[PDB]
């Protein structure tokens, strides 16, 4: 109710200022459904899915890389992605062997810098395997 | 003997309101948490605060006419 | 909180590496869409 | 390449970083996150700055404008942040960096 | 043994004071968590754990009162 659903993308912006029902958001410390008057919050985003539900039909899909909100103080959330990025245009056949790739590169990180950017990068190829 | 049986029992009826005391703790204490972040207190929050408080009660005061019945 | 902090990483570090990994997922098609990005083109040189 | 070179006779001391090779291929969102990394591999803390770019108004003319850019947590958590919830101090850490990749972009374009 | 009852009745009419026991821990630690995350305690987020604290103690006296009324 009375919520501009923003949303967009530095290429082509995607369902913008449009009086949509509710939103996922993909989120460290988990996905929160927005209810027509949703406590303002601006945190940023993990990887996953957005599932929007509207009241054309069925809902529609998408995937974001690394976004962010800033719902406010009246209804109005505004949401961000670097790569909203539609799901079909994703292979499988190259996209699993990533996941076992970094997992067995583990323990060849001499440094604790990028051994914490190994589990970021199978975080985020798990992030995909299950959504796919 | 006949008061025997009486005294005990009506001391071990108002035990009965020592668990209302305890669900009337949360009551006013959820609510402290949960207008801590949404000050919409003028509306439904203190109306829902005052039936979970009255209904809690009625668990207590419930026994507690129980309680006289025995006695009498 | 989580395992990235207290490693010396950030969240702009965070989403360069999970737009890349999105981005190299995708099929044989969609491919110059990756290159429309292309964010090596801007180059660093210090004072001293 | 070329505010360097105007400001490099008089201003030659208050300079971070430099940068080179923009607009020559056409700006992006990559671009503005080479901007907003190195701008954090550098160790000055900053609490208050601002951007100025040209606010394309026509074909004829353009105007230079300015915005400002809140950086500091303290400056960022104030009485409008009263009502705002879940965020941290540590969230509001992560908020805010993003929006340095977000305005550069906006004045990339 | 009539003064025997009357001596084991308010043995079990004063654990309904336990409850106000309980209940009370929750009320003035959940004043700790939604304390921090929104800084207006002058307002009415103490004024509601005073009423909380004391409307809970009123079910904390009233069982110690029946252990005075059934004694004497």
């Known amino acids: 109710g009375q919520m501009s659903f923003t949303f967009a993308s530095p290429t082509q912006v995607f ?14 410390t988990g996905a929160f459904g927005i209810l027509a008057s949703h406590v303002p919050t601006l ?9 929007v539900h509207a009241e054309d039909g069925t809902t529609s899909k998408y995937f974001v890389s690394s976004g962010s909100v800033t719902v406010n ?24 062997a990533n996941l076992e790739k970094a997992q067995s590169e583990l323990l060849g990180a001499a440094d604790e810098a990028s051994r914490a950017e190994i589990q970021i990068r199978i975080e985020a190829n798990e992030a995909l395997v299950k959504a796919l | ?39 919409s207190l003028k509306q439904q929050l203190f109306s829902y605060a005052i039936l979970g408080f009255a209904l809690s009660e009625a668990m207590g005061l419930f026994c507690l006419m129980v309680a006289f019945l025995i006695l009498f | 909180v989580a395992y990235w902090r207290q490693a010396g990483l950030s969240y702009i570090r965070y989403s360069q590496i999970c737009a890349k990994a999105v981005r190299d997922a995708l099929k044989a098609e969609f491919k110059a869409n990756a290159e429309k ?9 210090k004072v001293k | 390449d070329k505010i360097r070179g105007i400001l490099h006779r ?27 990394l190195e701008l954090l591999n550098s160790g000055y803390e900053f609490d208050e700055g601002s951007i100025i770019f040209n606010r394309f108004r026509s074909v004829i003319s353009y105007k230079t404008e300015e915005k400002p850019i809140f950086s500091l947590d303290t400056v960022a958590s104030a009485e409008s942040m009263s009502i705002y919830d879940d965020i941290d101090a540590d969230v509001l850490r992560n908020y805010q960096e993003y929006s340095l990749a977000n305005i550069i972009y906006y004045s990339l374009k």
């Open chain 4, 10 to 36: 008089t201003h030659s001391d208050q300079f971070l970083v430099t940068f080179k090779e923009v607009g020559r291929k056409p700006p992006t969102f990559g671009d503005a996150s080479v901007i907003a």
């Open chain 3, 37 to 45: 990005t292309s964010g090596s083109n801007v180059k660093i040189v």
């Open chain 1, 43 to 51: 945190q940023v985003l993990r990887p996953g899915l957005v599932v």
């Open chain 1, 73 to 96: 103080a009246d209804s109005s959330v505004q949401l961000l992605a670097e790569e909203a990025v539609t799901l079909d245009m994703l292979d499988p056949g190259v996209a699993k």
């Open chain 2, 1 to 39: 003997i006949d008061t025997a049986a009486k005294f005990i029992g009506a001391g071990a009826a108002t035990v009965g309101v020592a668990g209302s005391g305890a669900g009337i703790g949360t009551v006013f204490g959820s609510m402290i948490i949960g207008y801590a972040r949404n000050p």
């Open chain 1, 15 to 28: 369902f913008n200022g449009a009086n949509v029902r509710q939103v996922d958001v993909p989120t460290q």
